[PDB]
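Researcher: Here's the sequence for the chain we discussed earlier.
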Amino acid sequence: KAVYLWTVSDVLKWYRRHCGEYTQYEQLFAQHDITGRALLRITDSSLQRMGVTDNRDREAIWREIVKQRLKTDIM
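Model: Thanks. This is the structure I predict for it:
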């Protein structure tokens, strides 16, 4: 499924699969209503505003977001 079309549920499924060691934050994605379109636009600073203040955790999640953008872009 193209990321642009991902629902929040699609985002949560992606998050569980790729950020499985950071599940503690998973509800932030639902509470902030992060669709695929939002996922492609969010910044490291958005993550910190959602409450991922731990640097190493936020770095890890951010890298997964960038990895997904790269997959999307090479297509």
